[PDB]
Ligand binder design. Structure first.
Ligand SMILES: NC(=O)c1ccc2c(c1)CCCN2Cc1ccc(C(=O)NO)cc1
Ligand SMILES: [K+]
Ligand SMILES: [K+]
Ligand SMILES: [Zn+2]
Length: 354
């Protein structure tokens, strides 16, 4: 009946040497860590050490070439770092980026191991750079390796291939990498909520639409909940969890839950433009804790308002520790439309939606 926490100051070393104000800042993780101390959560948790992912672990999800290319950046001069980052959509690289990405993934492997070996019930990973946009063969959107996807495969590698893992991605962006990595898998249920705007919102692909339900034996195991029409908040997210995320997750019956927990849908985020409150994130966390005998690992993805992410992730940890949920309106029309589109898309696969 213990909550694990992983954080390591070394993940701050990845930085943007050309634009020190780029929103994916080092102090995202230190601010969140500090807020956990201030709220007296850190002393309630079991500290899990960070470690480097190995290259063989990276190969659970990534090509040898991709791994090789990111590793080669450790030794590059500034202009070669610039050139290499520019071969991707929305990436900056410093000499420390590869190590930090390794630490983010390995931290999460150690957390999943702690859960699956019974050392802890649940856990939180305060890590950067983020992961969910990283593809098999490429970096994207501040992400080098797909930490959550790798964690699902690492879990399978210490249990069985068919271990049922649910990944709930509540970052405001679509986890294109995660979707693609698991598109043909029925062992990993990917559920993403994300701002879409008919492709106007990053990463700007119709892959994120509600009709992408999975492929082959993975058909039904990819659930996209795309928002259109501007700001969404607690009412919409609670409704999506009520009608879609929780009924599907219960029917799937996961043995492990990973949260791609970006906090860029939060009130105050300059990129997300949404209004999810710390109390809202606490309720989402508490609902997920009813799955998988409580085996939930919360992995930081995006989120760029330092105060908002610190308060929101801390509230999630409070819920993992067993604190009672804090106290928390009709949905915007477009949100009803989105939810109904996903329900229609997934009723063929999930009896609970019928
Ligand atoms: N303010 C900025 O420097 C900045 C950087 C990147 C960016 C924007 C602003 C707004 C348009 C889209 N992008 C790319 C981007 C933005 C967010 C993320 C992210 O949070 N993914 O989960 C990944 C990539
Ligand atoms: K998402
Ligand atoms: K899948
Ligand atoms: Zn994001």
């Amino acid at each position: 009946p213990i909550t694990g926490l992983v954080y390591d100051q070394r993940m701050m070393l990845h930085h943007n040497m050309w634009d020190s104000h780029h929103p994916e800042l080092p102090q995202r993780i230190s601010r969140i860590f500090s807020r956990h101390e201030e709220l007296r959560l850190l002393s309630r948790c079991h500290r899990i050490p960070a470690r480097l992912a190995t290259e063989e672990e990276l190969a659970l999800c990534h090509s040898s070439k991709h791994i090789s290319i990111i590793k080669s950046s450790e030794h590059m001069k500034p202009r070669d770092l610039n050139r290499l980052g520019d071969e991707y959509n929305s990436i900056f690289i410093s000499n420390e980026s590869y190590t930090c990405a390794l630490l983010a993934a390995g931290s999460c492997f150690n957390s999943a191991q702690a859960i699956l070996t019974g050392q802890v019930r649940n856990a939180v990973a305060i890590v950067r750079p983020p992961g969910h946009h990283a593809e098999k063969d490429t970096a994207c959107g501040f992400c080098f390796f797909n930490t959550a996807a790798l964690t699902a495969r690492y879990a399978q590698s210490i249990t069985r291939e068919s271990l049922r893992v649910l990944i709930v991605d509540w970052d405001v962006h679509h986890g294109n990498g995660t979707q693609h990595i698991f598109e043909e898998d029925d062992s990993v249920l990917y559920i993403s909520l994300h701002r879409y705007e008919d492709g106007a919102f990053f990463p700007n692909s119709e892959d994120a639409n509600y009709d992408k339900v999975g492929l082959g034996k993975g058909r039904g195991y990819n659930v996209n909940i795309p928002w259109n029409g501007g700001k969404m908040g607690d009412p919409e997210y609670m409704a999506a969890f009520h009608h879609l995320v929780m009924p599907i997750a219960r029917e799937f019956a996961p043995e492990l839950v990973l949260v791609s927990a970006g906090f860029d849908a939060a009130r105050g985020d300059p990129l997300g433009g949404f209004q999810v409150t710390p109390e809202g994130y606490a309720h989402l966390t508490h609902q997920l804790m009813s799955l998988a005998a409580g085996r939930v690992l919360i992995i930081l993805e995006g989120g760029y308002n330092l105060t908002s992410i610190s308060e929101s992730m801390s509230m999630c940890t409070s819920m993992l520790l067993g604190d009672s949920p804090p106290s928390l309106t009709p949905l915007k029309t477009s949100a009803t439309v989105s939810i109904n589109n996903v329900l229609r898309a997934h009723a063929p696969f999930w009896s609970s939606l019928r």
